[PDB]
């Protein structure tokens, strides 16, 4: 009894699979659904087009090819989640055999009325990662909603930009725009509601979700969004030197000429795997291939667009984890789990070198930072010194851009909800002294403890993890269903609405509570005090 | 006609392998002297060789990218000619490897940055470089040198003791393009990769972001409806009935103003008004309460039996009707009509009637909205004699 679903491009045969938990019902899934034309040959480096139609019943039983990527090549480890980097061998099972024809998605249907739709966009880095590694079957059956995991052009193929008509760039985000267009017109057959679509991403993917809300094209596609440990305001969110790294790649493949047109046509002649095998190391804590400002998809600065009110239409839920910048200090930590004073001052000096690029009066900010993140209640503590040093990278890269995004959205009474994750699972993937790192909220959103330890998450969960994950899944589905995390299914705790004056957030953890002004002492430091010491523009 | 005269002869440059080299050659005369670049090199290319003609027809800028030793290193001449004369000037290029670069050579400290600026506000492109001797700062806009010799124009050359940059006072669409800076002294010339500049900014009249959508519910059923308006600067959002403002105006919100409909009774056209210093917009909402059906058409007696009567009637309503209620009773009796319920067709035969008795039949249209007015009645004539 295979399930049959009609679409605007042909019929698809899926499979009814029951979940291992007796409490959760069976779900219908349809894998490898083409939502756009193959971006090969001439379609390469071009906006996505609608997919070709098929006459018969197309098999949606096997996995589709992933986009060209390579994890063994040197990529910035700090951007990737730790569960990705701790198990590189397990991840390699999903990345094997990549093909340029990779524009396919996956849908999950739980089996009254139209069912809400949730669209996921995973982002390890802007070069790797895929939605196939995440199984949203638990979130589908638990919340009676539709979970969608997709793939999109990544790396050079999805973000090559020459800043002119030869290669506008932002091809990866356009694939996510095309997917949501196809989902909006074809999910009604799956029993889904196109008006209750909630796109949600994590990590770099959450940075992608933030960009889509600012796009002019996403107007009538979705209505809600959930951003998890990502932002369009980080240093790696937008590439502000794309022509430089693009021309460096063209010299590596030999296609570097003077006309940007002659070299783009030259690149399409090259194979898609020769471009990925090439390694390009950008400026540290910056991205070499990513989204650009093209004057169309991203017309202006992201923060500039937020003041315009572009994304006030959609209901927004966002938040960050406790210790996101684990890999920053992990190399400096001694075998005694401590950071020395010389190592602390050294790591702080490295921070000012990379992000701010040697301004005049730079020595003023090194000692200002060292004063801010030093617990004067315990000056000589090496472990506390490690604790505040992780909070340094965590505040500036994730916490600062997230609060600025939440204030610019809740500025005019638009529905906004903010959370803070303070719980992580226990395994050998990450050291025990470390807290919730990048991508640690992913399992609790999809209900991984409901199934147990997996090949990708060898964590040893407890009964408190299943209770917490069911709470998290209920908040997510409730928000995707009604725009309110508390309606219609209550918790068996009330999540208050966020506004820039009260700044009410939800402390997510084994002791769920509601506090105010999350880390607000450090937030105003980076937003108000830091730029004024960077505004040495008095010479002009 | 005037023979061509050189106005800006090319100077010999010295570029880096993998970089750029730009020569400048301009002339004047009558007619316009066309320029032909004739490289006298043993190895010639075409993909790197691109000539960029000036937008005003003065001269052309030869560009070679990327520089590769020793093929690009040759002698280049600028032949400006017309149908009156012919002149030529040669310049030399010097391309060296990555290691031949000595101490104090022009090194780009900070390259040009991506930036977006306002139409009338000041645009500033920054570029830092250091060398021994101190190199000279020159900018290139779309493979063309940036002319900043005139101080009266909007474009100005910022030159501080530390570093100099480029400043634009009032921006136009012309400024939108690729900008690249490069340092040059007696040692050589080393470029930095370009940085695109965009000039489009925030001062747009308000637009309806979430327009009010019309609805229909049974009267009484309260509902919270949303109207959102965006733009820079953010406009005041006001709900208006068309005569009086529903909002207190004193503390009217900005950006979003959801309207609460209490004690829904009659339909009405609501108007969400969003006004700003730039413009004012209006949006209408067709709030329509579900109305009752009009009385059906007059029925007609089709079949006249002694104990039964068949009737056919018109719906009388442009909207569909759920069912029809037949109301039968004696002619002049003041008794409440005995009603037949559940009739799903426009024709029904009433059974059980006592013979030779004049009856009165009424058809009732009822939908999900409620029971509409009764149709017009009729009478038939059956008579028996004893
Ligand atoms: C789909 O797969 C089944 C077996 O899994 C096979 O019998 C059938 O022919 C396939 N159909 C198509 C259109 O490939
Ligand atoms: C694995 O689970 C056991 C519970 O039986 C726990 O004691 C142990 O700490 C877990 N492993 C790690 C690495 O935490
Ligand atoms: C008014 O809008 C709020 C939005 O949170 C909603 O909770 C409430 O139910 C609405 N009231 C009515 C009467 O619909
Ligand atoms: C709304 O306006 C239209 C045309 O302006 C008019 O025909 C209609 O009757 C109005 N509706 C109400 C409820 O006044």
Author numbering:
A (entry chain B): 37 to 147, 174 to 554, 568 to 615
B (entry chain A): 28 to 413
What does the paper say about this structure?
The X-linked neuroligin 3 (NLGN3) gene encodes the postsynaptic adhesion molecule NLGN3, which interacts with presynaptic neurexins (NRXNs) to organize synaptogenesis. Here, we identified a non-canonical synapse-organizing interaction between NLGN3 and PTPδ splice variants lacking the meB peptide, which competed with NRXNs by steric hindrance. To elucidate the structural mechanism of the NLGN3–PTPδ-meB(–) interaction, we determined the crystal structures of mouse apo-NLGN3 ECD (residues 35–684) at 2.76 Å resolution and NLGN3 ECD in complex with PTPδA3B– Ig1–Fn1 at 3.85 Å resolution.
In the crystal of the NLGN3–PTPδA3B– complex, two adjacent NLGN3 molecules that are related by twofold crystallographic symmetry form a dimer in a manner similar to apo-NLGN3 ECD. Consequently, PTPδA3B– and NLGN3 form a W-shaped complex with a 2:2 stoichiometry. The Ig1–Ig3 domains of PTPδ interact extensively with the α/β-hydrolase-fold core of NLGN3. The NLGN3–PTPδ interface buries a surface of 1540 Å2 in total. In addition, the C-terminal tail of NLGN3 ECD lies on the meA3 insertion in PTPδ Ig2. The C-terminal tail of NLGN3 ECD is disordered in the apo-NLGN3 ECD structure, suggesting that it undergoes a disorder-to-order transition upon binding to PTPδ. The domain rearrangement of PTPδ Ig3 allows both PTPδ Ig2 and Ig3 to simultaneously interact with NLGN3. Our structural analyses suggest that the deletion of the meB peptide confines the spacing between Ig2 and Ig3 of PTPδ for simultaneous interaction with NLGN3, whereas the meA3 peptide in PTPδ Ig2 contributes to direct hydrophobic interaction with the C-terminal tail of the NLGN3 ECD. The binding site of NLGN3 for PTPδ Ig3 overlaps with the (potential) NRXN-binding site. The bound PTPδ Ig3 covers Gln370–Asp377.
